[PDB]
Symmetry: C2
Subunit: 44 residues, 2 copies
């Protein structure tokens, strides 16, 4: 419930850093074994 | 020259958000066509 908002926050941070828009950012989690991995992709 | 430091900044942001350490964060860019893609991976 809190992670979704942290992911949105990360989009803001990226938008400000490399001057991309929200549409140029992809964030998603995937299950890796017994743990999860958060993955971000930014088009530059 | 400035991007490396933004990437380090992103590590800080992630460390604070999902309470992971720097060793649990991987950030790297790859060339996609005529553009570049910034990719982040966080172990949760």
């Amino acid at each position: 419930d809190y992670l979704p908002t942290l992911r949105k926050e990360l989009m803001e941070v990226l938008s400000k850093y490399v001057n991309v828009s929200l549409d140029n950012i992809r964030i998603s989690q995937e299950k890796q074994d017994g743990m999860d991995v958060l993955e971000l992709n930014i088009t530059l």
